[PDB]
Amino acid sequence: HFYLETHCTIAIPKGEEGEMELFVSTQNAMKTQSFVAKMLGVPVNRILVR
Amino acid sequence: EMGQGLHTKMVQVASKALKIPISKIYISETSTNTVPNSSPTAASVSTDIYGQAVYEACQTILKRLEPFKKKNPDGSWEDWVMAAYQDRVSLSTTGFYRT
Amino acid sequence: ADELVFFVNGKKVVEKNADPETTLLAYLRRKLGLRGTKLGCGEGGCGACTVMLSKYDRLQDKIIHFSANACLAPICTLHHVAVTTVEGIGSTKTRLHPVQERIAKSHGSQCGFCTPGIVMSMYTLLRNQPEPTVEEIEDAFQGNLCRCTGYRPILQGFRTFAPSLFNPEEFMPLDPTQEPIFPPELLRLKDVPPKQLRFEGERVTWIQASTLKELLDLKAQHPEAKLVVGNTEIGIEMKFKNQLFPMIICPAWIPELNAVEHGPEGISFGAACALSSVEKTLLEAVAKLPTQKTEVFRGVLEQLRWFAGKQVKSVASLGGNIITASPISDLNPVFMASGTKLTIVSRGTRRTVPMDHTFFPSYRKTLLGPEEILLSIEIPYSREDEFFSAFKQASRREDDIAKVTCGMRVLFQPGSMQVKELALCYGGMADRTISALKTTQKQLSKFWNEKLLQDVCAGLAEELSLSPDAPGGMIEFRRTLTLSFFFKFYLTVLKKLGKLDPTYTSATLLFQKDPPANIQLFQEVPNGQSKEDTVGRPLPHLAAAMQASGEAVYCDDIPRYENELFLRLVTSTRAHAKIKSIDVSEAQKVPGFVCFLSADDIPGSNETGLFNDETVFAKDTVTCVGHIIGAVVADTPEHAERAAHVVKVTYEDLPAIITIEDAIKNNSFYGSELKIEKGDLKKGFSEADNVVSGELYIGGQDHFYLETHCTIAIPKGEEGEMELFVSTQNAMKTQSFVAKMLGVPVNRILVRVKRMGGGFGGKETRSTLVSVAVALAAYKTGHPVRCMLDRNEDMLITGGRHPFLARYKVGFMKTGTIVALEVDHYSNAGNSRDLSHSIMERALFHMDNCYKIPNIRGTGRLCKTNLSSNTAFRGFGGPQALFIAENWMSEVAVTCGLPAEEVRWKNMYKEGDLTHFNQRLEGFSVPRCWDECLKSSQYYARKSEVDKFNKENCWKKRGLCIIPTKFGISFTVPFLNQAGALIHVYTDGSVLVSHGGTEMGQGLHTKMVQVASKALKIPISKIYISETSTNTVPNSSPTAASVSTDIYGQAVYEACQTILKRLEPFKKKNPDGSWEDWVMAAYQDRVSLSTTGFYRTPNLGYSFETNSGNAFHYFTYGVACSEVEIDCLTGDHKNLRTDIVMDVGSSLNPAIDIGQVEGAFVQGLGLFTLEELHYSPEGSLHTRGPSTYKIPAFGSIPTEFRVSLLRDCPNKKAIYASKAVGEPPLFLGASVFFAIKDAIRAARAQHTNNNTKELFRLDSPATPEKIRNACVDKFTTLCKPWSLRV
Amino acid sequence: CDDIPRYENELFLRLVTSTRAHAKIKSIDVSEAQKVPGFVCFLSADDIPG
């Protein structure tokens, strides 16, 4: 692909109820959200992808 | 937005639909807590489908503002919006499209 | 410099560059990233920063555990000390400690900001006593404040360590064997002798002396060096007095300064001994030694009971209190009266002198030389024929500064009543501890009798004079206390010498706790209700566990960006003046200084405020002390603070209008008179058998949310975008005000509110004062910027409840029936309009309370003054008007000579009646609450018991009063009664709910989740609410008017209905499928799982011009009966019992609602009896901290506290038949005020006069000063024109 | 994404990837990695909570 900006993610753990806010260079915030929630083992509503 | 100008096009669409300058419209980012269960931005259909979703959302807004426009036809977009707010009419809505 | 080595939660900390000025709190929060410990006041009075400290005590040979205020603990005092914070005992990520589990499940956590500190105070107690007694449990919180709960749930839940809202049987037992072990490494370090340490900071050098020799050598070389042990005085001087001590020597480690010796003359304590140690030792001595030998010890102990709290007493040293020599020291008067021996030393010298009047020559000074230090203190055993008393009277019993405090000793000739020695020493009557030598000298050789009492009182009245301008004011009260204390001493000695009049006995009794008794009654949910349907169930606040664990994130807990700067507001020190110039030359010299911001830096508009009558930054003129002129931005908060403090502003004073009286005289008002008039007043007064006129005043109130105002502003650098994290109840206004100041479209600003550690209306609008300033800083610097107000800034700047002055005239019949009422209200609005108008409107809407007044006229004027702009505060004008109403109603009863409850009942509205603003009262439940409260409170039976007590007691009286209340529900501004919600159902079926409301501890999100769960018929476990944000739900009204549950509940409900309608087709095609199945099916079929919800309260719109239209959607009702016991000699009082019956319709959550009732009630209790703000004549606030502003403490609540939610009273006007509960209960706190008034009448009937119909004025708050002064007697009288017309 | 300022306590992650096209992972030694200044931790499959 050689997108000038390579893959990048910033993950911010809130420390509450498994909440996490992520800033991601992605075209798929939905899958990023569900995949992160799946790995963490928390409901999808706890993960915010921006 | 990955450089294809999707937000630019959505603002253009929203502006045309609402009949207001693009300067009054803004798109800050894409987030899972504003629009959920979104398909990945792909297949070159983003303009197509989000354009429709944005279009529909705009139609809902126009319909809610219609009573105030009729009430004060010479008024400004700002006048109608404030009137709508003061009359406790929701100025927030979702838009959706299914090909 | 030496390395500072200590442990935090079992982890070793090696600080190679310890700065002597760094507090443990700052270190924990900024260096260790442990934000569970909070900053609530920085002055040791709130306990929010409470932590536990553990150390190996060499002299005791064992590990000791004690609590301490992290805000006052210098990390440099913690070498080889183990710290335990809330994070160190448990968490929701691992497992909650029993203390955390219980405070959470018992509903002892609302906003949660005070929870960690209370958890640590309780935890520390248990580490010392695994099975504490109820009294030990209450005493554990003398230094912890909670503004939300009313304390009852915290104590009742913790009582377990010694339908229902919670089940103790579910609690995990406490197992001491599973507690964290004392750091092994520290236990090893105990085997290596102490060595002197040196710490070098930016401005201070700290020397930890290991031996007495080193200490004396250091003092000889550096006489100026400031000793520091507990730092509970120096810490205050540094932080609040702008003091800077370049060199500090901590002698805490020195064995001689910690030695306890039991000698033949008394018990000696090293000067470094903590007050808690002195207390423990003296308690043991009193338990083992003969009563006659412990008179002085018990005096010391009595003072220690009311000396700060556990946190302060555990670190505060004996030497520190003595040498600080504060005019209000509670111990020096005792040490002086008892001639306590002081051993003073310096290199090469040693002397021992008994403390006497000469020890304190002048303000804050003692007779110690510059090279001398206090080594030890020997508190003397009392001798035969020698008696001692110690008394203290403040504004509040627990953790307060003495108004007057004393130590009194008398020595008689062997076996006689003839005085050999007499010492009456007082604190709070001069700029130093003094002895009434002139007075006592005259009694030597005299006998203990009535003549001596009279002579001493007359003497005290003359010798302990106070000039009208005496610091602290309360001249009459303080002088009365000096005599009253002696009277108590006199009577007590008579008793000890012995035949005392039975009715006089209680006057000699020391304060005694009565066992608590709490009962909560609510309605069980229908038998067939699903377990998943939690509506109506006592579900604990969803974030309670995280609040108890310190995991709950409040604004300042959010990590700072690496490039984040700090802002410090620069405010006016003048009430009204022209700003001639601003000099930042000195500020620019402070390290880390970035810039000074002022009006000219604003890119958009400097016009702000709800009514655009405010500046963001003062321009040309300042209109109140605290008026924001600008702000300093620096690399650290300390640097920002120091720089701001040296910004020099030159003023030219302008005539200032401070008081309501000033405003009236100068016709200084905001807008025109507000008025509601119904009936024919003229005719009404003609018909009246009696007419009473009067004036009444009700003081203001500081919100004192445990978490002060705070804003973090993140500039994005794109299109003017800015994201702000704010502690506000009004994200919409925050957003628009920031946008307005910046001059950018509102759509560029994003405001996010996770939660507030309390709001109470104080964060409805005034939070923008900080938000806009921080936003400007971010805009100008391009860096993230934050600012959290220190308590003193917050109390000075942000405004509070509106003080009200009322002039009334009421006409009534001999039967007590009201036929006419005129009340002119005046509120002190401050330097801007803000919410003052609506507040006055609500006041007018409630001037009737629950009584039908055929002819009534109420007016209101907003006084424009040079004081910080007052704003919304739980009640929003209602409490003031309701108070004024109950005041004349109480006078009508007295005038008619009829039982108050009878007069109130016969005047009470009836179902269907119209209010003075012509709204029909539908579902008027006051009658039921009234009769049920009368019954469950056993009002009548107790009424007679009260009269009996009063006949049997001359210097103590009891009062009982039952009052009703009704509170109109809805914003009195029509358009604010709208609410939006946004709900998303993700493909895993989990639901994210967002609504316009904010969480400030009231449990709104909890209720919304409960609502959503019921509406969707899915477990609450599948629903979540993360925060409130302007980009999810726009144009939201502020979270206020107690209608959030009502309106957001409907919006959430509607959104859920839409979701259900969309899922319906899939549920039908797969009836036996799961929620998850239907959701995925809908998603797969491309059905949107996202929708908004909206609600608009119908039929609202009142007009003051026509006195027509519905002002409220409905009313919330309640009744409260309170009984009190006042000490007619000191002004102190006990809240014996309070019974509340509240109508909250069908409660959505009885736990949260009873919590709101108790919390509101206690806040009202504070408003009417403890809380008072004092201002200089020039308009400068004196009361800027918990040390001087006394909110209700754990010990302030009714001993017997009963709350019942009215049964079978569904409210068809709101979500799931519930009723708003936020504000309605607050006024019921007035039941305490009127019980006190009743008690005072009994006292006046006893010693004042015989006029049983006298109407003495009692303004709010009914503080110890007002209560004592009202109890006119031979003492108040002791504390002459040429001619008089005949 | 990476232009977003880092938090004061923000850490950095570096992926450890396979140098073989197809093989069994016999063992992983991080004893040398742990010596690198600033090393916080090595994360692997067993660290995943979900």
Ligand SMILES: Cc1cc2nc3c(=O)[nH]c(=O)nc-3n(C[C@H](O)[C@H](O)[C@H](O)COP(=O)(O)OP(=O)(O)OC[C@H]3O[C@@H](n4cnc5c(N)ncnc54)[C@H](O)[C@@H]3O)c2cc1C
């Ligand atoms: C929330 C709060 C509540 C309080 N409540 C009360 C109260 O009810 N009644 C009351 O009287 N006080 C009260 N205090 C005041 C304070 O706690 C006492 O004065 C305390 O005993 C001082 O002890 P310290 O060790 O903390 O002093 P520091 O602050 O460490 O030192 C105080 C002063 O004593 C000097 N000093 C200390 N030890 C020696 C020594 N051995 N020889 C010579 N000089 C010495 C120091 O140089 C300094 O000037 C309160 C303080 C707070 C913060």
Ligand SMILES: Nc1nc2c(c(=O)[nH]1)N[C@H]1C(S)=C(S)[C@@H](COP(=O)(O)O)O[C@H]1N2
């Ligand atoms: N714990 C806590 N309870 C509280 C408050 C608070 O700040 N903290 N605010 C009070 C005020 S002034 C109001 S208007 C209501 C607001 O919330 P509500 O509308 O959901 O009842 O809660 C009341 N109860």
Ligand SMILES: O=C(O)c1ccccc1O
């Ligand atoms: O309580 C109200 O009536 C009210 C009205 C306008 C704004 C804030 C409010 O609390």
Ligand code: MOS
């Ligand atoms: O469909 Mo484009 O993201 S290949």
Ligand code: MOS
């Ligand atoms: O209506 Mo509350 O925010 S005073």
Ligand code: FES
């Ligand atoms: S912040 Fe420490 S006692 Fe309030």
Ligand code: FES
């Ligand atoms: S819960 Fe205690 S102050 Fe809020």
Ligand SMILES: [Ca+2]
């Ligand atoms: Ca105001």
